[PDB]
Amino acid sequence: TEEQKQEIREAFDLFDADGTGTIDVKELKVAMRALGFEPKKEEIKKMISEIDKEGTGKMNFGDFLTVMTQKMSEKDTKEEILKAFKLFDDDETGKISFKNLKRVAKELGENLTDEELQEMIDEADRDGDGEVSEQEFLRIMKK
Amino acid sequence: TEEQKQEIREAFDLFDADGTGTIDVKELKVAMRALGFEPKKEEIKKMISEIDKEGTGKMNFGDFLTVMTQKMSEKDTKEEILKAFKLFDDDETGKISFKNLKRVAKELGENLTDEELQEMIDEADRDGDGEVSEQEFLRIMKK
């Protein structure tokens, strides 16, 4: 929308007080923070490389807007995915257990055998702890 | 289910008036009809061959109950698949078109390119008419 397109503009202009139409790519973390994102070190490393593939050290508004639209959409889906996670994890243990999965399948009228439900846990359970973390659920959803 | 098992016993007993515990395998079509099936010629051929692998001409109740349980499960699965077909074919053209498939995928928040949707049509489109028939859909739902 245009409202948020303007918030993005305002955040950019914070780092362009001289009106050059570019800002230092090193300001990305603080600019994202201004917009309410708290990107991790690995995310920043990746974005800066992605945004500045020519190695100029500067970014323009169109490129900032492009990256921020992507981060906003990524954020919206992550939040929706975690809404579903909480709907599986109704005992709030912070992991989706075999019990949680079985309950959901029953409530939704999907006839899965214990073997098929166990297959689903195994597919998502990358770390080998026998249950499904938010990171594992995010992974298995975003694919 | 116990009531359904009773109904199957009653249909078997129609063809065993002498109380021998067996009925002629040639009665299968009429026995199945009594139970609300209308098996096609090829289906009868295949079942009779499967039921009477020793070639005796006769079947017992346990054989009959096993096959009727299978057929009932298969009928339920077929009806469910056909319910799904109708949910794709919302224009009631009797075929699932690229339009129907695109509409479904979009409605279910599934992001597929036209190339990916065309690939699904081609996969299911065995007869080469460019859309998906009930038989084609049945086939692809059981694989």
């Binding site: 995915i81 709907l87 599986f88 999965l101 939704l108 999907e110 998502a124 959803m141 | -």
Partner: peptide
């Protein structure tokens, strides 16, 4: 099946 169920859960929640 994970996507199937997750979306089922979110459909149900919305209808409510």
């Amino acid at each position: 099946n994970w996507k199937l169920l997750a979306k089922g859960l979110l459909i149900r929640e919305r209808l409510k």
